[PDB]
């Protein structure tokens, strides 16, 4: 027996807690050898420990970690509780969740940071030059406005 | 001049209590433990002496 217009209400009820640790939360590892890495919560072991799995796109193998070490993201993918890594890989690729994450603010900023880190001196200089050019233009526009 | 119901009511507050055998605290008539820290919350409760 369907709802009709209560559906809308349910959709737009601001909950305090979104991002529940559950099967198929995206998860950004904060602490350890794996950090800045993404990885999905496959199972949950106990109130504090979770089994994570970067399905082989990401660097991180199936293993148990403390929930403390995780940073749950807005992204989810529906998966069967039992799901082994191959299946996870299949699903995530199909659903394009990683792309979505990248598009999202945090992911974007992460990738920008990575780019900055990996830059050559020249590339840094190029960016500086560009900024200078922009500043010039910007300054001119400000002057015009004033 | 204390009509019986009123008297009863009064008693309910002033008289039908338990008392800690240790620190003398006034307790509700149905209490098991003293509630006061200095006794170390004893189980040794007695009825408030009537008349």
């Amino acid at each position: 027996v369907e709802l009709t217009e209560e559906e809308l209400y349910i959709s737009k009820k601001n909950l305090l807690f979104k991002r529940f640790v559950e099967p198929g939360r995206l998860c950004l590892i904060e602490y350890g050898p794996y950090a800045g890495k993404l990885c999905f919560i496959v199972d949950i072991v106990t109130i504090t420990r979770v089994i994570v799995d970067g399905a082989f796109i990401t660097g991180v193998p199936r293993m148990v970690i403390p929930l403390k070490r995780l940073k749950l993201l807005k992204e989810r993918i529906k998966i069967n509780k039992n799901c082994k890594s191959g299946f996870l890989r299949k699903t995530v690729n199909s659903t394009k969740v990683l792309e979505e994450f990248n598009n999202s603010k945090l992911g974007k900023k992460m990738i920008i940071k990575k780019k900055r880190d990996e830059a050559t001196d020249f590339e840094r200089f190029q960016v500086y030059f560009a900024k200078r050019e922009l500043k010039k233009k910007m300054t001119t526009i400000k002057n015009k406005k004033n | 001049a204390i009509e019986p119901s009123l008297a009863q009511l009064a008693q309910k507050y002033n008289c039908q209590k338990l008392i800690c055998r240790k620190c003398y605290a006034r307790l509700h008539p149905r209490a098991t433990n003293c509630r006061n820290k200095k006794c170390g919350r004893t189980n040794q409760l007695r009825p408030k002496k009537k008349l």
Binding site: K131, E133, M138, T140 | -
Partner: protein, 201 residues
């Protein structure tokens, strides 16, 4: 600690931890302006804290109390004392470090307009479980005869309006800048623009 002078907004911080953080920095060699020290927190209940402070007060020097433990009871002064406790203040270096610390109640004549940093290692939000009793230092001080609490609060309130006003202007400026950038991304060169886009800006 490579800046000239860190201003620390002491609101929401846990007294001792904050003090500890300050002390090391001071030792290293770093002026620190602990600002808004009325709002520092202590991890006990209020009553417990008061009791501790009462006990402290009680320890004067029997013989001649002009000397002996000075019971400085402005929150800032308390903070300062705490900081001192964690410094080798009987040396020269320690003394210097101590001197480097300035503490204030509310925020005054430069430290309104300086950036205010926060020590998140010593933040009450991150360091006490929410079912634990804490206590605002200012209140504690008041309880133990500081008096100038209400006045301070009033001053803070006054300052907040000013800050808000400033913030509006700042926001507007930011918006304008953004607009200009949007306009003037189109007017550069293509390749340069592309490069800029690639690295975030």
């Amino acid at each position: 600690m490579y800046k000239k002078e860190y201003v620390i907004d002491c609101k929401g911080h846990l007294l001792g931890r904050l003090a500890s953080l300050i002390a090391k920095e001071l030792l290293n060699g770093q002026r620190i302006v602990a600002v808004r020290c009325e709002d520092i927190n202590i991890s006990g209940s209020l009553y417990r804290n008061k009791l501790k402070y009462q006990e402290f007060l009680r320890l004067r020097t029997n013989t001649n109390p002009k000397k002996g433990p000075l019971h400085l009871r402005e929150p800032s002064k308390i903070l300062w004392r705490c900081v001192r406790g964690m410094l080798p203040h009987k040396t020269y270096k320690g003394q210097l470090a101590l001197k480097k610390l300035k503490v204030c109640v509310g925020m005054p004549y430069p430290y309104d307009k300086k950036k205010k940093y926060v020590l998140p290692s010593a933040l009450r939000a991150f360091r006490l479980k929410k079912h634990r009793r804490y206590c605002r230092l200012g209140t504690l001080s008041s309880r133990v005869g500081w008096n100038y609490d209400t006045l301070v609060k009033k001053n803070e309130v006054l300052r907040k309006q000013v800050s808000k006003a400033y913030y509006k202007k700042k926001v507007n400026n930011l918006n304008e800048k953004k607009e200009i950038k949007t306009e003037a991304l189109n007017l550069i060169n293509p390749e340069q623009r592309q490069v800029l886009e690639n690295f975030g800006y």
